[PDB]
Write a structure and sequence with these properties.
- This is part of a larger assembly, with one copy of chain A, three copies of chain B, one copy of chain C and four copies of chain D.
- Chain A is 0% helix and 22% strand.
- By secondary structure, chain A is an all-beta fold.
- Chain A has two domains: 1-44, N-terminal domain of TfIIb, CATH 2.20.25; 45-111, N-terminal domain of TfIIb.
- In chain A, the strands form two sheets. Chain A has a three-stranded antiparallel β-sheet, with no helix packed on it. A two-stranded antiparallel sheet of chain A has the order 5-6.
- In chain A, strand 1 (13-17) and strand 2 (22-26) form a beta hairpin.
- Chain A is elongated and about 65 Å long.
- Chain C is α+β, with helices and mostly antiparallel strands.
- Chain C has one helix and three strands.
- Chain C has one helix at residues 52-63, and strands spanning 20-25, 30-35, 41-44.
- By secondary structure, chain D is mainly α.
- Helices cover 27% and strands 0% of the residues of chain D.
- Classes of the chains: A mainly beta, B alpha+beta, C alpha+beta, D mainly alpha.
- The A-G interface holds A 14, 16, 21-23, 39-47 and G 32, 35-45, 50-51, 66, 74.
- The complex binds zinc ion (3 copies).
- The site of one zinc ion has 7 residues of chain A, from loops.
- It is classed as transcription.
- Keywords: Transcription, RNA, DNA.
- The entry is titled "RNA polymerase II elongation complex bound with Elf1 and Spt4/5, stalled at SHL(-3) of the nucleosome".
Chain lengths: 111, 129, 64, 49, 147, 49, 85, 42, 49
C-alpha cells in the first residue's frame, strides 16, 4: 500500500534522520517531509500465500454454471450453496475447494 | 443483463448481438461485431418465480403453428427466434451457460440394458440450473 | 565510459552532414557534441534515458 | 482432456468437475454407441493422432 | 507492452510500451504523463484497484522511479516525438505537436481519434496494464489464442 | 461384470478426488499434487479398462 | 532431460539410511530453498531493536550505519534437509 | 403443455432450413456488402 | 537503501548451502541386478541407487 504525499502527489522515499536517529519518508518533487511510523523499508517474501482467498465476488450465488452442494453453510445453514477451487494459477495450487455459501460467501473447508 | 437479454429475446435488439457476463472478473461485455460465429439453442425457463422454471419455453402450440405456417391470431423460423423460444449464442457466450444435451435431461429420471448407452453419472451437482 | 559516435546528424554552422559526433559521457551526466569541420562543441547534461537524438534536439533549441 | 472452457471441458458440464466422464472417459463400447460428449472427445483424440 | 527483464534481473521489472510510428519502446509512465496524468498518484489510482495487493504496487514501482525525469506534459511529449520516426529538424516546437497528433491518432483509434478524450485512453491503458500484470502475477491463466 | 467393474473404478476415482481435495492424498516423488493426482487417475482408469 | 545414474558402494547400496545421507549431501540446496521471507528493517539502534518479533531473541543473544537486513527461514524445509540454522 | 418429442425437434429444424437454407450466410454477406458497404467505402 | 536490497537479492541467489552445483534434485531409486552366487549360480539382488 505504498502511498504518496497529500499535496505533492509524488512517491515517498524512506530517508533516515541521522541527526535525530529516526526514519522518515521523503519526496523529491517537494519539500513536504513527514516522519515514518514504521522502520520497515522493504518486505520481499518468497512463500507467496497472499490473496488466495481474494477470489471472492458478491454475485457468486447468481451464476448457474456453478454446481449446488448439499453441505451445511456455517453462517446461513442453507442446503443451496455453490463451491469452487483456488483461482490462483500456481503450479503448486492446492485442491482445497473454498466452498462458498450464498448469504455469507465465506471461504471454509471441511478438513 | 436480465433486461438486456429480455430485450434481445423480444427482438428489439438484433438477435445476433452477444450479451456476455463474466461474474468472476466483475466484467460485462457486449458484442455486435461482424464475422463472429453463432448457433441456435432452445431457451429453458430459469426464473425461480413461476412454475415454468426448468421447462422449455417452447410448447406444442409453437410446433402446431410452425406446421401450419400462420399464427391463429406468416409464422416461420424468424417468428420462433423473435417470439422468445430460441436464441443464437456465439462462441464466447457459451462460456457462461448450462446446456442440457436433450430435453429428457431437464427432467430428473428414477432399465439396465446391455445394447444401449448409459448417460454420464452427473452426480457431482446435487442440483442443476 | 568514453563513447565515439560518427552519427549522421546535420550541423548548423558548417552545414555538413555526418560532421556531428554525439559522444556519450554518462559518468557525471555530461553530454558533448563534437563536430569535424567547424569543430564546435555543445554541452548538455544527459539523464539516464538521454540519447544522441536528445542532445541533437537540445542543441537545435540552443542554436535558436 | 483439458479445460478449453472456463474450468470445464464442455458447457454441458458444471464448473469445477473432475469426474472421469467430465474429462473424456468413454464408457460405452462401440457396439453400444457413444453419447455426444464422448463422441466429441473421441474425435479430439483421433484428430490429434 | 513488453514486461521486460527477468526475476531479480535488471533491477526491477521494467515495463515499456511500443507505440505506433515510434523508433523505440517507451517507459509506461512516460506515455502516461504525456497523455495528461503527470502526477503519479493518479497513475497508481488508474492502474491499481486493490490497495492491499501491495505486491503489484511494489513491482510496478521500478517503472515509477525511472519516470521521475519527466514532470510535465510538454517534456514528456517532446521525449515521445523525439523518437517519432520522423526526419531530423522538426525540433521541439513542432515535436510536441507531432506527439500530440500521434497520441490523438494512431493510438487505440477504435476508441477515438480526436482531442479531449485522452481520459478514456488513460483509463483503458490502466485497465490493460492491470490485466497484463495480473497475468504476470499468475492470478489468471494466460489468454488462450485458440479460444 | 463389466458394469460392476466400471462403477467400482469410478467410485475409486471419486474417493481419490475426495482425499486429494482434502490434501489427504500422498505426493509422488518429483510430482506435485495435480500431477500425481492425474497420474493416479490415469492408472486407475487404464486398469479398469 | 539431463540425468545421472549414480551407483553407490557395495555396503551403502544395500543400506537405505546411508543412502538418504548421501542424497542429502549431494542435493544442491541453496538458502532460497530454505529461506521463507525477507524484510529490510531500518533498525536505528545498532545495540538493540525496535522489532518485537525478535526483541526477546536479540536481547538474550546480546549477553556503524544503523541499516539492518532481516530475513525469515522456513523451519519445515531446513529440518527436511536436516541442517540447523 | 405436453413434453416435446424428437419429431418436434426435427420439425423445428425443418422450418429453420426452410427459412434460411444451407448457404444463407454467403448471400447475406454479399447482399450486405452490395447494399451498404460500397457507399461507405466511397 | 538500494545497496541493501541488491545485497539481499545476491544472498537469495549466489549462496550455496550444500550439494554439488548443477544438481536440481536427486531421486532414491532401487535397482535390480543379476549377480553370481556362492555356488556360481545367478541370483537377482535388489540394490539402492
Ligand atoms: Zn511530494
Ligand atoms: Zn452459506
Ligand atoms: Zn559543424
Amino acid at each position: 500500500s505504498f502511498r504518496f504525499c497529500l499535496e505533492c502527489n509524488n512517491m515517498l522515499y524512506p530517508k533516515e534522520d541521522k541527526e535525530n536517529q529516526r526514519l522518515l519518508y521523503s519526496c523529491r518533487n517537494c519539500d513536504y517531509t513527514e516522519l515514518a511510523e514504521d522502520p520497515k523499508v522493504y518486505r520481499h517474501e518468497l512463500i507467496t500465500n497472499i490473496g488466495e482467498t481474494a477470489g471472492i465476488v458478491d454475485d457468486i450465488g447468481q451464476d448457474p454454471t456453478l454446481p449446488r452442494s448439499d453441505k451445511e453453510c456455517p453462517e446461513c445453514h442453507s442446503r443451496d450453496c455453490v463451491f469452487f477451487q483456488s483461482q490462483q494459477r500456481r503450479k503448486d495450487t492446492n485442491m482445497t475447494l473454498f466452498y462458498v455459501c450464498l448469504n455469507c460467501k465465506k471461504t471454509f473447508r471441511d478438513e | 443483463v436480465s433486461t438486456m437479454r429480455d430485450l434481445r429475446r423480444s427482438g428489439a435488439i438484433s438477435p445476433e448481438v452477444s450479451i456476455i457476463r463474466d461474474i468472476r472478473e466483475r466484467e460485462f461485455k457486449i458484442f455486435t461485431d461482424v464475422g463472429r460465429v453463432y448457433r441456435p439453442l432452445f431457451i429453458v425457463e430459469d426464473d425461480e418465480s413461476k412454475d415454468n422454471k426448468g421447462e422449455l419455453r417452447i410448447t406444442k402450440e409453437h410446433i402446431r403453428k410452425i406446421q401450419q405456417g400462420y399464427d391463429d391470431d406468416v409464422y416461420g423460423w424468424s417468428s420462433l427466434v423473435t417470439s422468445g423460444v430460441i436464441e443464437y449464442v456465439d462462441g464466447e457466450e457459451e462460456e457462461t451457460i448450462m446446456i442440457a444435451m436433450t430435453p429428457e435431461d431437464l427432467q430428473t429420471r428414477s432399465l439396465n440394458d446391455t445394447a444401449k448407452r448409459i448417460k454420464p453419472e452427473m452426480s457431482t451437482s446435487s442440483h442443476h440450473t | 565510459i568514453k563513447q565515439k559516435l560518427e552519427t549522421q546528424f546535420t550541423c548548423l554552422f558548417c552545414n555538413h552532414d555526418n560532421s556531428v559526433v554525439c559522444t556519450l559521457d554518462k559518468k557525471n551526466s555530461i553530454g558533448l557534441l563534437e563536430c569535424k569541420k567547424c569543430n564546435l562543441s555543445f554541452q548538455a547534461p544527459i539523464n539516464s534515458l538521454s540519447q544522441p537524438i536528445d542532445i541533437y534536439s537540445d542543441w537545435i533549441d540552443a542554436c535558436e | 482432456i483439458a479445460f478449453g472452457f472456463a474450468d470445464r471441458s464442455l458447457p454441458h458440464f458444471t464448473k469445477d468437475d473432475f469426474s472421469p466422464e467430465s474429462k473424456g472417459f468413454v464408457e460405452n463400447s462401440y457396439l453400444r454407441g457413444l453419447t455426444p460428449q464422448e463422441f466429441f472427445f473421441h474425435a479430439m483424440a483421433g484428430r490429434e493422432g | 507492452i513488453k514486461l521486460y527483464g527477468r526475476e531479480d534481473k535488471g533491477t526491477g521489472r521494467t515495463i515499456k510500451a511500443t507505440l505506433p510510428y515510434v523508433k523505440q519502446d517507451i517507459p509506461i509512465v512516460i506515455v502516461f504523463r504525456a497523455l495528461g496524468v503527470v502526477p503519479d498518484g493518479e497513475i497508481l489510482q488508474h492502474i491499481c484497484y486493490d490497495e492491499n495487493d501491495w505486491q503489484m504496487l511494489e513491482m510496478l514501482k521500478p517503472c515509477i522511479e525511472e519516470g521521475f525525469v519527466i514532470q510535465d506534459k510538454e517534456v514528456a511529449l517532446d521525449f515521445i516525438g523525439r523518437r517519432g520516426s520522423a526526419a531530423l529538424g522538426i525540433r521541439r516546437e513542432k515535436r510536441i505537436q507531432y506527439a500530440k497528433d500521434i497520441l490523438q491518432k494512431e493510438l487505440l483509434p477504435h476508441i477515438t481519434q480526436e482531442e479531449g478524450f485522452e481520459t478514456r485512453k488513460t483509463f483503458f491503458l490502466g485497465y490493460m496494464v492491470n490485466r497484463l500484470l495480473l497475468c504476470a502475477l499468475e492470478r489468471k491463466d494466460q489468454d488462450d489464442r485458440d479460444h | 461384470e463389466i458394469t460392476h467393474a466400471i462403477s467400482s473404478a469410478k467410485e475409486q476415482v471419486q474417493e481419490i478426488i475426495y482425499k486429494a481435495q482434502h490434501n489427504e492424498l500422498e505426493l509422488k516423488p518429483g510430482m506435485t499434487l495435480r500431477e500425481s493426482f492425474e497420474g493416479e487417475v490415469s492408472r486407475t482408469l487404464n486398469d479398469a479398462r | 532431460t539431463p540425468a545421472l545414474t549414480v551407483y553407490l558402494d557395495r555396503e551403502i547400496a544395500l543400506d537405505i539410511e546411508k543412502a538418504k545421507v548421501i542424497q542429502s549431501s549431494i542435493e544442491y540446496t541453496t538458502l532460497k530453498n530454505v529461506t521463507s521471507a525477507t524484510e529490510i528493517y531500518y533498525d536505528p539502534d545498532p545495540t538493540s531493536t525496535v522489532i518485537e518479533e525478535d526483541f526477546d531473541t536479540v536481547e538474550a543473544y546480546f549477553s556503524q550505519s544503523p541499516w539492518l537486513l532481516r530475513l525469515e527461514l522456513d523451519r519445515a524445509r531446513m529440518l527436511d534437509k536436516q541442517l540447523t540454522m | 403443455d405436453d413434453t416435446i418429442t424428437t419429431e418436434d425437434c426435427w420439425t423445428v429444424i425443418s422450418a429453420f432450413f426452410e427459412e434460411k437454407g444451407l448457404v444463407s450466410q454467403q448471400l447475406d454477406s454479399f447482399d450486405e456488402f452490395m447494399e451498404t458497404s460500397i457507399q461507405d467505402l466511397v | 537503501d538500494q545497496m541493501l536490497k541488491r545485497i539481499e537479492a545476491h544472498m537469495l541467489d549466489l549462496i550455496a548451502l550444500r550439494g554439488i552445483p548443477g544438481i536440481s534434485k536427486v531421486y532414491m531409486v532401487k535397482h535390480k541386478v543379476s549377480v553370481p552366487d556362492e555356488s556360481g549360480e545367478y541370483k537377482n539382488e535388489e540394490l539402492w541407487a
